[PDB]
């Protein structure tokens, strides 16, 4: 998953715009911090192209 998320971000992110592009790459599943987790809803960071991560 980690590798997937990165390759798409690198490749397509440019289409959304440079302003849109933020680096906070990585993922923390433990409750130690709440940074590093993409979602357009939060002002903390944003997805840089229409991407949703679905976890069943």
């Amino acid at each position: 998953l980690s590798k997937c998320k990165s390759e798409l971000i690198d490749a397509f992110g440019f289409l959304g715009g440079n302003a849109f592009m933020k680096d906070k790459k990585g993922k923390i599943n433990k409750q130690d911090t709440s940074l590093h987790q993409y979602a357009s809803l939060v002002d903390t960071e944003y997805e840089p192209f229409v991407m949703y991560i679905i976890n069943l």
Partner: protein, 312 residues
């Protein structure tokens, strides 16, 4: 000569009398809080004491506003240079001194509120002058309501960045974003006329002054001509206020001080008299004596450790 007033208990009556004695005081008669009408309890004096505390309050209110520092000087006697000149050998005329200070407090409050109302309006219009100028000129549609512009000032180009991401995600690319560095930052988003409120919510939440027109002087065509004439009225109206502020500062700074010293002596006169019931059961003795007029000066300087004076 001048009638003089003393107060104590009857414990140090003798030690007080002796010391009174040595300053050439004459016809010393001990009395009570009843026999002289002035020195008799009344509800009237409880109010009078309040009128003096309202004067004291007023002095602080006035001194803050004029930007003239706190005054301590603390006289009630004529021995001192400023005590003689700023505190009159004749007794108090309570109605008058209150009446001088009451009016000025009132006139001062009205002025000050108005000065504040002028100062914010002027600083905002001079600011949004430039903004509207840019945004209209950028024309032939923004002297009407055909196209929609949102002029606005923002103090972080950083928070403006955050707004561009938001706008784009949920409101597409209907923004054209232009920016100029100002003295603030001038931001401009430009948008349709049916999504107007939607952009506003976003703008509101990150705190910007993005309004569709930032001034309300509008009513001549182009908008900017009315805004410039209103700002010529604003500028001189603050000046005129300052001139008024000055006139009042020159008349009353010295007077303020002279009232302050007077009032010290009046708080004393009501306690002497016994101003209320507490005062009565604390000082049961009030004495009478005559002090010759020249001498009257060294007497009020003297303040024992329980004795305060009023002269006439």
């Amino acid at each position: 000569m001048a009638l003089v007033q003393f107060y104590i208990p009857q414990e140090i009556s003798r030690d007080s009398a002796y010391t009174l004695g040595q300053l050439g005081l004459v016809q010393f008669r001990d009395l009570n809080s009843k026999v002289r009408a002035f020195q008799r309890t009344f509800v009237n004096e409880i109010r009078r004491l309040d009128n003096v505390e309202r004067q004291y309050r007023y002095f602080y209110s006035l001194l803050k506003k004029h930007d003239i520092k706190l005054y301590e000087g603390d006289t009630d006697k004529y021995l001192d240079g400023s005590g003689e000149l700023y505190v009159p050998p004749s007794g108090s005329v309570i109605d008058d001194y209150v009446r001088n200070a009451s009016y000025l407090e009132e006139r001062l409050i009205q002025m000050e509120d108005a000065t504040d109302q002028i100062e914010v309006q002027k600083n905002d219009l001079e600011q949004y002058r430039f903004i509207l100028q840019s945004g209209d000129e950028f024309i032939a549609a923004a002297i009407g309501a055909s196209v929609n512009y949102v002029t606005g000032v923002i103090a972080r180009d950083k928070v403006a960045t955050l707004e561009q991401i938001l706008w784009r995600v949920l409101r597409g690319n209907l923004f054209f974003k232009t920016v100029e560095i100002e003295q603030n930052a001038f931001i401009v988003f430009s948008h349709g006329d049916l999504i107007i409120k939607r952009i506003r919510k976003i703008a509101e939440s990150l705190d910007a002054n993005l309004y569709d027109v930032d001034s309300s002087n509008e009513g001549r065509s182009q908008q900017l001509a009315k805004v410039n004439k209103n700002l010529s009225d604003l500028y001189t109206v603050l000046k005129t206020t300052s001139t008024t502020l000055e006139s009042e500062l020159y008349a009353i700074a010295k007077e303020l001080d002279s009232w302050f010293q007077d009032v010290t002596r009046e708080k004393a006169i009501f306690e002497i008299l016994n101003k209320s019931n507490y005062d009565t059961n604390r000082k049961i003795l009030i004495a009478e004596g005559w002090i010759p007029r020249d001498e009257l000066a060294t007497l009020q300087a003297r303040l024992g450790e329980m004795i305060a004076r009023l002269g006439i």
